């Protein structure tokens, strides 16, 4: 249990989010992942914290990063993307550290899409779940982590 | 097509939320609904806007109030409570005004609870859905309406 | 044993129907609820009867009205709208008067819409069910009530 | 693109309906298919139109017939009977002519019967679906084709 | 937690129960809701208590009433009728007061009827469910509240 | 009300049964459809009746034949083959004549095959259902018709 | 048939009930099955009747006792315990004597436990079903039988 | 691989069949289980065979009796009654002897009753399944066992 | 047990395919069923074989024809259309001749359509299944039959 | 909590296991139930313990024996065989003694067989579950019980 | 927007396909993955194009490669193997470039195997789907990409 | 093939098992994965065998390792952890070598946990499945591998 002052917020981005801004902008906006990173840095700095923002298309890599967060970070904001719907491994990785504040963010409103996107394994462990609020949802994520680590 | 300056944000609260603060505090907190209304006032004032905060246990009264919002309010933040899981009628009321920003809020993380609580009819229409962020999710909801109204 | 001559036909409209004509015209049309009442008044007048045309967003008020109709009305034409899919209470209220002719009307074709709209509780009691015939469906309902009540 | 004045309405009847009036009169009534055809003739005549009334126990023949309508008829009133629940081929035939007005009719209230009768494939293409209005439902069918063909 | 001596037992009746005795007598009997009320007065009196007997067709009103019971009554006997199968709101209302004794009553045996009537949301909170015992199940509900209020479990 | 003495038992056979004896002998045997017919004539003759034995690959043809039985035969022994699993039309055709004795026969034990073969629409109307008794199931079907048409 | 003064009420207890009072007291109480029997004898005595109270872990033995009840008892109060959820045999035993009043009792609130406990086969035959009223449910069961026997 | 001449056909009856004749005659007829046994005696005798006719309300006793048949009888005609729908144990017991002919009989047409009555565990092992042919179904059962025992 | 040299490939087309070209061309194209036949002939000829191309809206007729394919043709290319999803009779007809090469073809990509179109009874017997490759799927079908018959 | 030193380990075998060694040898092998009992004795003696090995085809008798194990044994190694899939009663019997170490064994890999065999009611109570390790799975059960009963 | 002449076709093979030819030859045949690459090179050579043939057991790697194709290749022939049934990530990666012709290929007839193999997440995005046509299915994939890219 | 004497037993550990002993002790215990490795080494030594003990959070790596086992190991003891419930790829890797003895081990009693954990894809291929026997279950795994390779 590290404070925002003492350790960064881990910001984990799942598969395909590296291409944010290039595709279906009605759904994902025209902002890039670098744009989202800047939003997070800004939100975190208003609370005196920092962020460790990362993206990967590999499930095992995200699990590896979650374990790292357990030791060195004050919380996790995670947009699991497609792995939200299929990754028990990601869920179990978040379950390994009980105390750590976790906020799940979906840029798109998953509940308006295909029936298989309605269920997220991460939601049973996330403290909070933000969906369909665009890239603003990442800001919400940082704010809630700030409130929880506080 | 109203700005925060021209009309208040309707903040609609479903059944049993009048008792916020007296029950299951691990889930719902120790803040009262009056406390939540005070938070929403301040959150909207940060954007120069105002709120019209209401609560009812009646699904029909909620529908009636959604219809009013279509003509009088700049958006809706709604916490449908139990009616999230049962009310097609509230979903259809929200669907009668396509341009109105709508943000759904759940104090608790409904995805951690019983399986019948995992589905929300309101989520198919709401612009955004915030769950499990405590009463702070209302602040999120107001900020998302302020952003959607502002563009 | 109550004709159209002895008592009005109750035309009951469920939630959101008060905004008919303003929303989704491809599905619902551009006629108003008032236009619908006019179509019912006329169809009833052609059979020597009259209509008592009501609308509510409240499930309980619909139930109260169905109880009133048992005593004062020759039949019910009901568009339950969203309550078709959720209200066991309205089904049960229609079931409290066995002999009263009941016709269920849906302006849209609910079978072309989402899977949750495909089922209606009211349909297991309604004598007949008319769907996707537009506002003309209410004229068919009055006509079926006239035939049954006759 | 045909009107009621320029081409007949096709009234298509599915399997077992040739026996209307001899069986389960609680469900189907004491009227015969000839009585139904007279109702349709009368209803079409009130809009200055004509009917082409047909019955078949064969799914493929119904398909064949539906194809003939595209070319020669102003709309279809179809009582698919048992094929309502089983026939994707009838559904697809009806889908081959997007503009043709189609109204599905069930004499019985299929929603009061066995669960396998609750679903109809035809209902996803039919402009309108009338069920449980007895043989009167064919009159409604013809009236709705007249409205649709006249718009 | 109020005793029977200090506060009435609330008896809440859901939709269509105003018509009891008029319809389907094989299922519901020929007694009316006022006969039911008399039975409850009698049973409560036998334990030194009183009832506050109410009926509504409105889900919201039943929720409002459950909230009143929370502060003013000793327990609730509820026949949710149709709302049994659809109302998470009523379930949640009953969930807001953890120690209030609650007994759910169905006149009819819902397990012998349509499959949609077999499930009741109320049953996961109720501290006893009585079904198919006719109007006598309201007496059983009163007796069970009396036993729960009186106990110091 | 037609007796064995006054009218033949209609013996109906579904799709692919014309090939009996040519395929999967472990399931269907090495006897042919003509051998089955001989078995039925013989079983019927012992009670002084006769059989009208037919086979079709066409659902609508089977329906047509069922209607024919209503008036001319004393009962139906039916092996619907694939149509048992898909035809609501055949079930409804059998439903049109309440009093007529009907016995459903499967050569194979359909409950030992793929899950989609487990359900038969015909079984909810058939007075009796014989499955997995080989071609001897037809003889039981004639014997059962003979007792039903005799009490 | 039989009245309370003519024959005893059969009270039948299914599996694991012999251990009542030892395990899971939160769910089942701290009273023993012998305490339950005494509750029942008192309840019946107040109506001029008697009780024949039994317990078995064997489904067949329960069936054998239900058959016995048909000829010698005024009704049955049955807590089928785990057999509620699995035994069609016991349901069918109860169904063999139409007029015998039957009341099903569960000590625990089966609707608050595992989902497989929500369904009881006995409930479709039982006149009344009492669940989650603790051992007092047995008292309600006797009272109900007394009302139905006397009518 | 017993012939009808060497051992009896076992006719096993499940729960509640002891009451046959007393209830629901519309579905079950007014013949008693003793009537059915006599019918089975005569049916087997037409093929030179005999029967061993038993009834129990106990699932475990039916399993015990199926085990006995594997060694002592030429086939099994079984009407499992309610255990058709619930007893994996009785299915497994019949599966323990691969060559024994088995024919399942239901007096009632189970496919017309409640949905839970539509499935039988026994039907996946039984060579043949006869339902809704009344007590005559037992005759069909014996005839089928005579044919299967006769072919080899 | 015949070769492309000794017997034709039966190309069977199910219901509504007689109308190919006149309906939904994004899904079915603008080529006709006569064009498809020409394509089949060209492809069978490149392997020295011939085709017997047929169409019917009748399930029973299709079964009759599969039965003829057995002592007469060298394989079947079948586009069952709607009967794919409904016809156990057709599946069973294809099952009576164990050795006959069968290739199933759908012009549309049935996995992108309604849920009831996702399942095909025919696919459990078909050697190969080609979907959503337009009318070119029929050439694939002939080519596969050629390779199987080889 | 009875130790290995002071009370036998109950080895409870369900229906049909008396025939081990006579059928489906690829699934169950060629060892007999007697051979399994010897393996158990040997495995237990290696830990200073003994075994009380039993088999029955009767679900109620298994329950009665589970009840005995609560008072006389140090743990139970149970192979419920077909009752694994059907018996709520045996699961509830096991649930009446919280602390008793219980290990479920299946000779066959139940997950490779029919879908109805995939689920076992005993598995939600068993400390551990061993499947498809052959008769060696009983030695693993004895070894787990030794570890759980020990310290 | 690239043609066969200006950019290679990406051929992506999923997990376990590296072992092709070593087991279950009834299902998978006795040709190697290298034998399959040769078939693809030759089919593409005949339409003037080239192939970039790859295999991986890693879902994230397959997503990484799909992102590459979006900018450097004219089309994708993908045999997702086991990831066809589990990978929403792969579906989403393919959905990020709407114009690219995608053809899904299965060597075995997935509809004749276990019920979990019947659904493919890839089939809802693939232009076409070829199953059960053995390694020859890859040649149809290439032929179909040639047709669509033109 | 290889015996215990000639090749090591592969012991494969899936995601999150690297943290064994640090979390959820009631379910997983306080022994570490090094403790589990020692138990495996001890159990195999008692049979004249050796072990090759590995862990990864990466599904494709686990697949790569399974392929290695095929040529180099006498059998596999595998605790797939979360991948039991989601990985068709691992199940397919295991099926690539029919005769290799495979024993699946779960430390926790997956049947007492959430409903999604009750199903394992690996269980349809594994010779035996041990669950809820704690870290002792690996010992059972090794013993069973020893009996099968014999």
G148 in contact with E, Cβ within 8 Å: no
G22 in contact with J, Cβ within 8 Å: yes
Structure tokens belonging to residue H122: 């026994």
Give strand pairing partners of K13: K55, K79
K113 is an annotated ligand-binding site residue: no
The answer to whether the CB of L3 falls within 8 A of the CB of L149 is yes
Closest-CA distance, F89 to chain D, in angstroms, reads 5
Residues of J in contact with G56 (CB under 8 A): 60
Of residues D83, D35, D146, D105, the one with CA closest to residue C128: D105
Closest-CA distance, L83 to chain A, in angstroms, reads 7
Report angle CA D62, D64, D66 to the nearest 5 degrees.
Answer: 70
CB atoms under 10 Å from CB of I34, counted, come to 11
Q: What is the largest CA-CA distance in chain D?
A: 41
Q: Which residue of I has its CA nearest to F60?
A: I60
Pairing of strands J51-55, L51-55: unpaired
| Contact (CB<8Å) B67/C18 | yes
**Mutual angle of helices B59-72 and C59-72, in 10-degree steps:** 110
Closest-CA distance, A137 to chain B, in angstroms, reads 9
I148 in contact with K, Cβ within 8 Å: no
Closest-CA distance, E142 to chain B, in angstroms, reads 26
D15 in contact with F, Cβ within 8 Å: yes
| Contact (CB<8Å) G136/E126 | no
CB atoms under 10 Å from CB of G1, counted, come to 11
Q: Which residues of C are catalytic?
A: 28, 106
Distance CA F129, CA I10 (A): 38
Q: Where are the beta strands (DSSP E) in B7-137?
A: 9-13, 51-55, 75-79, 102-106, 128-131
Residues of H in contact with J24 (CB under 8 A): 95
Closest-CA distance, G48 to chain J, in angstroms, reads 35
For residue C70, report the phi and psi dihedrals to the nearest 5 degrees: -50, -40
A85 is an annotated ligand-binding site residue: yes
Instruction: Pick the catalytic residue from J73, J106, J121, J138.
Output: J106
Q: Which residue of F has its CA nearest to D57?
A: F60
**Chain K: partners with 3+ C-beta pairs within 8 Å:** A, I, L
F11 in contact with H, Cβ within 8 Å: no
For chain C, the domain total comes to 1
| Contact (CB<8Å) C111/D120 | yes
Residues of C in contact with D150 (CB under 8 A): none
Nearby residues of J84 by Cβ (< 8 Å), 6 or more positions away: J14, J104, J106, J110, J117, J120, J121, J122, J123
Q: Which residue of E has its CA nearest to B57?
A: E60
Chains L and H touch (3+ CB pairs under 8 A): no
Put simply, the chain B residues between 65 and 124 with a CB less than 8 A from any chain A CB are 103, 109, 111-112, 118-120, 123-124
The DSSP element (H or E) to which G102 belongs, if any, is strand G102-106
Residues of J in contact with H93 (CB under 8 A): 15-16, 57
Distance CA C31, CA C42 (A): 15
Residues of H in contact with G63 (CB under 8 A): 15-16, 57-58
Which residue carries 């693809």 as its tokens? K40
The DSSP element (H or E) to which G12 belongs, if any, is strand G9-13
Q: How far is CA A143 from the centre of its chain?
A: 12
Of residues L43, L42, L6, the one with CA closest to residue L150: L6
Catalytic-residue membership of K138: no
Report angle CA F36, F41, F46 to the nearest 5 degrees.
Answer: 125
| Contact (CB<8Å) J93/G18 | no
Count Cα neighbours of F119 within 13 Å in the Cβ-side half-sphere: 12
| Contact (CB<8Å) L23/A97 | yes
Of residues C59, C51, C96, the one with CA closest to residue C80: C59
Q: How far is CA D66 from the centre of its chain?
A: 11
Of residues E133, E139, E136, E128, the one with CA closest to residue E47: E139
In the three-class reduction of DSSP (H, G, I as helix; E, B as strand; rest coil), residue L125 is classed as coil
Residues of L in contact with A98 (CB under 8 A): 23
Closest-CA distance, A148 to chain B, in angstroms, reads 9
Pairing of strands L51-55, L75-79: unpaired
Residues of B in contact with C14 (CB under 8 A): 89
In the three-class reduction of DSSP (H, G, I as helix; E, B as strand; rest coil), residue F128 is classed as strand
The answer to whether the CB of A76 falls within 8 A of the CB of A96 is no
| Contact (CB<8Å) C63/E15 | yes
| Contact (CB<8Å) G57/J60 | yes
Q: How far is CA I91 from the centre of its chain?
A: 13
Report angle CA L16, L20, L24 to the nearest 5 degrees.
Answer: 95
SS3 content of chain A, % helix, strand, coil (to 5): 45, 15, 40
Nearest neighbour of A111 by CB, restricted to B109, B129, B134: B129
Of residues D70, D143, D133, the one with CA closest to residue D103: D143
| Contact (CB<8Å) G22/J61 | no
Q: How far is CA L50 from CA A41, L9, L14, L145, L147, in A?
A: 51, 6, 20, 12, 15
Q: Which CATH number belongs to the domain containing residue A2 in this structure?
A: 3.40.50.9100
Q: What is the largest CA-CA distance in chain E?
A: 42
| Contact (CB<8Å) F16/I63 | yes
Distance CA J2, CA G128 (A): 43
Report angle CA A60, A63, A68 to the nearest 5 degrees.
Answer: 130
| Contact (CB<8Å) C16/B61 | no
The answer to whether the CB of F77 falls within 8 A of the CB of F10 is yes
**Chain F: partners with 3+ C-beta pairs within 8 Å:** D, H, I
Distance CA D32, CA A137 (A): 65
Q: Which residues of E belong to the annotated binding site for substrate?
A: 79, 85, 92, 107-108, 117
| Contact (CB<8Å) K93/A57 | yes
Interface test with I, best of K75, K103, K109, K121 (most I CBs within 10 A): K109
Of residues K77, K81, K57, the one with CA closest to residue K66: K77
| Contact (CB<8Å) H86/G91 | no
A52 in contact with K, Cβ within 8 Å: no
Distance CA L16, CA A62 (A): 12
Beta strands across the sheet bearing H9-13: F51-55, F9-13, F75-79, F102-106, F128-131, H128-131, H102-106, H75-79, H9-13, H51-55
- Structural domain range at position K126: 1-150
| Contact (CB<8Å) G133/E136 | no
Give strand pairing partners of B76: B10, B102
Q: Where are the alpha helices (DSSP H) in chain A?
A: 25-28, 33-45, 59-72, 88-95, 136-149
Distance CA C51, CA C43 (A): 9
Chains I and E touch (3+ CB pairs under 8 A): no
Residues of G in contact with E137 (CB under 8 A): 128
For residue D107, report the phi and psi dihedrals to the nearest 5 degrees: -65, -50
Q: How far is CA B87 from CA B93, C84, E60, K138, L13, in A?
A: 10, 11, 13, 50, 46
A117 is an annotated ligand-binding site residue: yes
Q: Which residues of H are catalytic?
A: 28, 106
Of residues A80, A73, A9, the one with CA closest to residue A41: A9
Distance CA A72, CA H23 (A): 75
Beta strands across the sheet bearing K9-13: I51-55, I9-13, I75-79, I102-106, I128-131, K128-131, K102-106, K75-79, K9-13, K51-55
Pairing of strands F51-55, E102-106: unpaired
D23 is an annotated ligand-binding site residue: no
Each as own residue / partner, the long-range contacts of residues J34-37 (CB below 8 Å, 24 or more positions apart, any chain) are: J35/J135, J36/J135, J36/J138, J37/J11
K60 in contact with A, Cβ within 8 Å: yes
The answer to whether the CB of C124 falls within 8 A of the CB of D110 is no
Closest-CA distance, A44 to chain B, in angstroms, reads 16
Structure tokens belonging to residue K14: 């999923």
Q: After which residues are there C–N gaps above 2.5 Å in chain G?
A: none
Question: K91-117 burial by CB neighbour count: b if 16+ within 10 A, else e?
Answer: bbbbbbbeebbbbbbbbbbbbbeeeeb
The one-character DSSP state at I32 is -
């Amino acid at each position: 249990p590290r404070s925002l002052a003492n350790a960064p917020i881990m910001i984990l981005n799942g598969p395909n989010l590296n291409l944010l801004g290039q595709r279906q902008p009605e759904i994902y906006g025209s902002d890039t992942l670098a744009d989202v990173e800047a939003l997070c840095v800004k939100a975190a700095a208003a609370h005196g914290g920092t962020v460790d923002f990362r993206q990967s298309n590999h499930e095992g890599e995200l699990v590896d990063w979650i374990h790292e967060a357990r030791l060195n970070h004050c919380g996790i904001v995670i947009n699991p993307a497609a792995y939200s719907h299929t990754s028990v491994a990601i869920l179990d990785a978040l379950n390994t550290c009980d105390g750590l504040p976790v906020v799940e963010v979906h840029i798109s409103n998953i509940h308006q899409r295909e029936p298989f996107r309605h269920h997220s394994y991460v939601s049973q462990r996330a403290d909070g779940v933000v969906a369909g609020c665009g890239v603003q949802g990442y800001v919400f994520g940082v704010e809630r982590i700030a409130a929880l680590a506080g």
